[PDB]
Design a protein around this ligand. Structure first.
Ligand SMILES: Nc1ncnc2c1ncn2[C@@H]1O[C@H](COP(=O)(O)OP(=O)(O)O)[C@@H](O)[C@H]1O
Ligand SMILES: Nc1ncnc2c1ncn2[C@@H]1O[C@H](COP(=O)(O)OP(=O)(O)O)[C@@H](O)[C@H]1O
Ligand SMILES: Nc1ncnc2c1ncn2[C@@H]1O[C@H](COP(=O)(O)OP(=O)(O)O)[C@@H](O)[C@H]1O
Ligand SMILES: Nc1ncnc2c1ncn2[C@@H]1O[C@H](COP(=O)(O)OP(=O)(O)O)[C@@H](O)[C@H]1O
Lengths: 183, 702, 702, 183
């Protein structure tokens, strides 16, 4: 079905020549008169929200899920290796966790190795290969850590390490699908 | 110059808000903001406050979060040295180096009372493959063993910040650290420690947050701040809790004035204490002055004197003083209306008994430290627990925790205390073991009982009839007509009747402290004339309660008061002084004649056999009380009716052969209650008094 | 004899309860009871009351239903001639013969105003393959065409009961039938007609149901019934609705006493009306006396006279009279405390503004007659509709219904009226078309505005400064400082300020009736000294409101009052009489000098160019108001900052080649606001006044 | 899987020789003193119920469904023909509507005929053959009416009409599974 369109990035490969972000004065951190005026309106609205107790309906949920799936038709996933290397790939929201694990075994140093994926903090391991990326909160874009029983085994792959790119470049592939659709 | 940065860095400029996720390293953002910054879920970000202090947290998406807002919990807010509403700057920092080694030490006051290895218990599972971002000077907490332990990060390699890899070495060598002033306690009250009312909090935040946090901008904003607020509801609702949290989250100084406590002190010393209280708040301003139990002040000369002094201090607070006065009580009506008028206390918030959905929040708050068994359903407990305010559920979780500990030094091993699990049975126990049977729904009534309805006790009846037309204590075996006599009085005196059992005075967990003690007398006063009836006065023992009863008592009189007990021996004789209640009336088991009258009275409602001898029923039943006598007659009928219907069913069926047959001389079988009905109905059980006891009742008066 | 049947037939002896299923032929039972009687779901049962009247209904299982209880709706209860709490007997009757033919005729008052064939519209789909059990004399209802039509069953073949088969012939020949006395209207109020409060109903049922239904057993039960009850909340909450429903469901007589209406009548005629009212209730007892708007009576001589008369009648009601007095008002505090004391009105129930979940119930109740489009989500409407009481949502559904009818005799065809569907757009329309902008959250404030902050209007300033240190009407083009002047006064007079727009006086649907009119003045009185500011007095026109304003006004004075309008021509001159407000102050567009002062005042906060001529800005902007002048300066800054940052971004990038280079003589580019910033910022739009109008403002005074 | 154990009953075949149910006096329909005392306790409990607003949890629902399925392990269904004849059969709670429709086609005069099943009042036709008897509220015991486009077609079957029994007898087959389990 989908094109994975894989890439690999590492913090070292980032140019890291960037100019320092300008340090900020105390003025930036203090509020305008209108800020207070707006902040008050936040408290008022939240108060009124709790008072009337709006109805959450099953029709609304299904409608919100739909408009959410339509907003992000393609899901971007990043598997972070213990060696700091990052494996990036694209997925459909209805893709499973197993589909991700198979995607990992593909680019590995060998499929023979046993491993596991998890999200942090705290450590939560994904046991369910049936589970979709949507209900696993891997949506729309998520970072996943790769664990293993014998981590000395998982090097990812050397050939891909030659194709490895800058993290800032990997984001420009993602930013396309985030601010806009597939093209 | 300014508007540039705020416009230029506008995507990076966010305002702090309360967080859903209670994790230490987790902050939440809105999905559009997440995308705008090109942020992945679980990615690392850097936060910076006005204090120049930084932090490193993992970012997650939140649908409930506003775009302009960021939400972080207590732990993060303190590490950034910021509070709710404050402005921070955020950048998506990918680089962060995996820690080579780190150094972390516990805070001394949190670790008091335990032995063991805190690494293997707390820090080990906490940092294991969680890849948590960590910066120097950070203070986080780990929960376990009925305890919340704070840990401080001494130094990191590299610095200031790093993340903890499975390859990172955690150095725990050292001594527990003394606290620092700049870092407020996380065992100090906050919003996250208040369950059951979000709304009431939002109402309070709306009024007091901005005037306390920055009054000078709130000044120019033009809206007029409340000078005082009246919190009301039953005790243990979180009113004092709310006051402490609000003042804390706003960074405002907090001064507590206890209503009774300040009232004790001698004339002129009290007035001097109010003045010092307000002056100190004005000195430490912005500040919150909390007055606990305001009805103990303004609901003699000195009585008014301190009230007028209070009104001066209240009216003496200008907006520039940056002081907001909070006060708590039961109902606003109990407070002098002079206080509730505009300009002093303008607004009032109702802190009530939480609903089921609310009690779940409270439970979740107090179980956070303890490890729960998998069979524990807290929401189901919430449904089972009724009429519970915050203090009760807190006491519930505290007790239930102890029960598990009761399976087993003065100083406990940290490992086993942490591994201890609290089951549902532990809760069912704690919910069972100690609690009334309070609130209790006390009901005013006008009994239709007369002297006629009461069999026997003629010697007693005449005595009571003379006394009317200061108090009475009925004592004797239970079920002989103690209560019936009380109503016969209320009917003859043509007054209202109020029945109350002893523990109804006490609260849950049989608390000796009772505000409700006078509350009964109040409604006993509301109705009039009225007969106040204390059932089971011996149940007062789960002390302070007995006296405060005598006070209220003597304070009035027209209200008539009647005590009743089946165990008078343990009743404190001080309640029995002649000035209070003269008559001590002993009601014995109904004698042979009395039983005949009782049995007759019950059997007059349904047909009776020819062979039945009532005097013989009075024989075969002696140790019987009135309750038993009225019961044995009901069973007899029950046996009589079941026998008739199975006979009546037997006929209906036997007519299936020939329905057409009608026999006129053959009549309907007449149901009758005969001797073997009573003979059989005498089994059901049991509840009898010892013959020894009877003497103790007779030998009582002395 | 009795206890036999009740024990023998105990499985068949049930008590009536409110039903979930609103269908005509459906009754609900508990699953264990369903099994005990060997009843299938959807099976036919027979019901019988004390009245000997029978009924035949389809039985369904309900998990919420008690075992001892049976639930049936209004339609069934009346056909059995029983009410809530009554006892019925039930048997599982399988036999029922398929109807060969039946005869059914409509009730006259329900069919008023329509032409068409009622069979093909109502009865046809109702009876089509529904296999409904039907008995003679039964009165059911079918809903459609914004209407509920009642049909009576004249006769059945066979009789008394049968079921309607597709082979059954329905005979509709005849004339609409006049109502009968024994059958109460189903357009008469009931519990099922009350949404948004179940709880408040349960509280009322608990107190008044049993004393009203059967007082004699409630007498012997011993508990003391409430003599009176105070219902409170805003208007249109269902208080009068509740009173009518409770009295109806209990079968108690209902008497309404309108508070103002009875107060109008001359001295001695009023007192005579109370006496007649109570005497009539006592005659028709058990009865409910509903007093509408009690604060119109007891919140002069005759003022107290009727109150004392009321207290006599209240205290003159013994429990044996079987009369319960209900009264409605805004808040219990507005009522004389002498009424709220024990023995007269003991208990009070809060009927409040319903939450979102509650408004859904109300919607569902009023849409039951109308056919809804599939795109209509009522729960989503419930979220969109705020601050709406029952009367408002009822008015909402009524209006939304009309909108659909607005697509198109004085008498309408029944077919097309029934086929008419109401869409969501119809609701969005009705929710939009008429409603404020009311409640409105009126806020007391203390403005920091001074005379300095207001540019120009020096001739006006001096005038105002003289008047202080009876009222004022500001008029002129909008945005020239009407409101600013009002606050400058409040600050100089050192008083409170209250801003209120015209429609805030009116309710939703721009109702001329306003209780809140005085409510503003009340808080204007609560605060003191205070400046009451009416913004857009011309908006009062959506009459009665104008007068009641003048009354309240004259009633006091220290409260100062200031009106403001951009369209004074339509303001009723009666409000302008010299006795009320003398000064009429015209505020024109700021002149050339005034604009310079205004522009300067705004531009003092940020750097300005060397080439910019302020006097020239006062030229290029003339028809500009103060609102425009303060806006055009904000846009200029916005253009200035966006230009600077895109320049500042341009540099940050161009430094990527050589970061190491530092040039000391090269300085930071200084942001400046120049002429072409204002030139470009002049576009945004628009809102100008006609030159014709200016004359009308000048020519106003007369 | 399950044994249908079919039977057919008709109101005519009911003996209908039964003695009249005794008519009842007005005493039976009037309340005891204690009735009022109990009725008051009903209002009180319902009031307190609405005040505290008990939590309905997904765990409780699933628990209630389970104890409901365990209480009635076998479902009894009755299809009522327009000719008044009743077709009775036993089903599992997880059986579908289609399984019922197939059960009907079995005993018909011919499978060739087109028909439909529905529950009343009001008329609600079961379109979903995937739907289980549980979620269709056919549980534990339900009566279903049989509709058809050309009803003159459906006679049920003549051979079964010879095996047809009394309705009172058909209930004794059901009462076994209702008051008690499968045996
Ligand atoms: N809403 C609540 N959430 C959590 N705990 C509560 C709440 N309300 C009360 N408590 C518990 O009750 C105890 C007493 O609260 P406090 O406010 O001091 O007394 P009161 O409520 O009578 O003013 C506190 O220790 C607190 O743990
Ligand atoms: N002297 C008596 N005559 C008739 N009935 C009695 C008598 N004493 C007790 N009973 C029955 O026993 C029950 C318990 O009576 P009560 O006075 O309420 O309890 P106690 O005497 O233990 O306070 C009552 O319901 C009443 O019917
Ligand atoms: N809870 C409610 N459910 C349904 N309709 C309501 C409710 N409350 C008010 N209404 C509508 O508001 C109208 C006015 O109600 P009423 O009780 O007569 O006035 P008030 O509530 O001011 O006493 C009624 O016609 C009714 O249709
Ligand atoms: N004379 C003035 N001087 C300075 N600013 C003014 C003047 N008149 C109006 N403004 C600006 O226009 C805006 C509208 O003023 P306001 O008095 O609230 O409206 P209106 O005059 O239509 O009642 C204010 O925010 C104020 O900044």
């Amino acid at each position: 079905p989908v094109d994975r369109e894989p890439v690999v990035c590492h913090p070292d490969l980032e140019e890291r020549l960037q100019a320092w972000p300008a340090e900020l004065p105390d003025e930036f951190f203090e509020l305008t008169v209108d800020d207070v005026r707006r902040r008050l309106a936040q408290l008022k609205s939240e108060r009124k929200r709790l008072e009337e107790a709006p109805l959450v309906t099953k029709a609304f949920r299904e409608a919100q899920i739909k408009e959410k799936l339509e907003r992000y038709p393609k899901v971007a996933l990043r598997v972070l290796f213990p060696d700091r290397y990052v494996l990036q790939g694209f997925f459909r929201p209805s893709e499973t966790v197993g589909d991700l694990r198979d995607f990992v075994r593909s680019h590995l140093g060998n499929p023979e190795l046993s491993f596991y994926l998890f999200i942090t903090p705290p450590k939560t391991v994904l046991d369910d290969h049936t589970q979709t990326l949507f209900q696993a909160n891997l949506f729309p874009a998520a970072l996943v850590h790769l664990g293993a029983e014998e981590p000395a085994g998982v090097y990812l792959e050397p050939g891909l390490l030659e194709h490895a790119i800058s993290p800032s470049a990997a984001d420009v592939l993602v930013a396309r699908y985030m601010s806009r659709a597939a093209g | 110059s300014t508007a540039i940065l705020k416009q230029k860095n506008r995507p990076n400029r966010l305002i702090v808000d309360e967080a859903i996720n209670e994790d230490n390293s987790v902050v939440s953002l809105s999905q559009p903001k997440m995308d705008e910054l090109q942020l992945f879920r679980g990615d690392t970000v850097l936060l910076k406050g006005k204090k120049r202090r930084e932090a490193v947290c993992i970012v997650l998406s939140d649908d409930t979060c506003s775009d302009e807002k960021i939400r972080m919990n207590r732990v993060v807010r303190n590490n950034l040295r910021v509070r709710l509403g404050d402005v921070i700057s955020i950048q998506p920092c990918p680089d962060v180096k995996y820690g080579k080694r780190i150094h972390v030490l516990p805070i001394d006051d949190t670790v008091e009372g335990i032995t063991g290895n805190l690494f293997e218990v707390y820090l080990k599972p906490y940092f294991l493959e969680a890849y948590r971002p960590i910066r120097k000077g950070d203070i986080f907490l780990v929960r376990g063993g009925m305890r919340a332990v704070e840990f401080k990060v001494v130094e990191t390699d590299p610095s200031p910040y790093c993340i903890v890899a499975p390859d990172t070495v955690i150095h725990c060598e050292g001594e527990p650290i003394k606290r620092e002033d700049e870092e407020e306690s996380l065992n100090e009250v906050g919003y996250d420690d208040i369950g059951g009312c979000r709304k009431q909090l939002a109402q309070i935040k709306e009024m007091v947050e901005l005037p306390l946090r920055h009054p000078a901008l709130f000044k120019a904003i033009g809206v007029k701040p409340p000078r005082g607020i009246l919190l009301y509801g039953p005790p243990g609702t979180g009113k004092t809790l709310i006051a402490r949290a609000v003042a804390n989250e706003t960074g405002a100084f907090f001064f507590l004035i206890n209503g009774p406590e300040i009232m004790s002190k001698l004339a002129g010393e009290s007035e001097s204490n109010l003045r010092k209280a307000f002056e100190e708040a004005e000195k430490n301003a912005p500040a919150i002055i909390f007055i606990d139990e305001l009805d103990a002040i303004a609901p003699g000369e000195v009585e008014r004197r301190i009230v007028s002094q209070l009104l001066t201090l209240m009216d003496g607070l200008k907006q520039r003083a940056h002081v907001i006065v909070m006060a708590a009580t039961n109902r606003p009506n109990s407070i002098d209306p002079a206080l509730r008028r505009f300009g002093r206390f303008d607004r009032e918030v109702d802190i009530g008994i939480p609903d089921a959905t609310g009690r779940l929040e409270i439970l979740q708050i107090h179980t956070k430290n303890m490890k729960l068994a998998d069979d524990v359903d807290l929401e189901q407990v919430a449904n089972e627990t009724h009429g519970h305010v915050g203090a009760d559920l807190a006491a519930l979780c505290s007790e239930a925790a102890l029960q598990a500990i009761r399976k087993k030094d003065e100083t406990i091993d940290a490992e086993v205390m942490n591994s201890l699990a609290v089951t549902m049975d532990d809760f069912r126990w704690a919910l069972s073991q100690s609690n009334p049977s309070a609130l209790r729904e006390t009901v005013v009534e006008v009994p239709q009982v007369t002297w006629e309805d009461i069999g026997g006790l003629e010697d007693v009846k005449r005595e009571l009839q003379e006394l009317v037309q200061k108090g009475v204590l009925f004592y004797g075996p239970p079920g002989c007509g103690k209560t019936l006599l009380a109503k016969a009085i209320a009917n003859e005196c043509q007054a209202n009747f109020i029945s109350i059992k002893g523990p109804e005075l006490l609260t849950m967990w049989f608390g000796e402290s009772e505000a409700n003690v006078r509350e009964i007398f109040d409604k006993a006063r509301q109705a009039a004339p009225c007969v106040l009836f204390f059932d089971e006065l011996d149940s007062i023992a789960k002390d302070r309660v007995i006296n405060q009863i005598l006070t209220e008592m003597d304070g009035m009189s027209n209200v008539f008061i009647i005590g009743a007990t089946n165990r008078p021996d343990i009743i404190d004789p001080a309640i029995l002084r002649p000035g209070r209640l003269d008559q001590l009336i002993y009601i014995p088991l109904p004698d042979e004649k009395s039983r005949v009258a009782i049995l007759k009275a019950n059997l007059r409602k349904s047909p009776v056999a020819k062979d039945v001898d009532l005097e013989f029923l009075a024989k075969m039943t002696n140790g019987f009380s009135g309750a038993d006598l009225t019961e044995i007659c009901q069973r007899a009928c029950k046996l009589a009716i079941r026998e008739s219907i199975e006979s009546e069913i037997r006929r209906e069926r036997e007519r299936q052969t020939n329905p057409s047959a009608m026999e006129v001389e053959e009549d309907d079988p007449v149901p009758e209650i005969r001797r073997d009905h009573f003979e059989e109905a005498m089994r059901f059980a049991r509840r009898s008094v010892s013959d020894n006891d009877i003497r103790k009742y007779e030998m009582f008066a002395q």
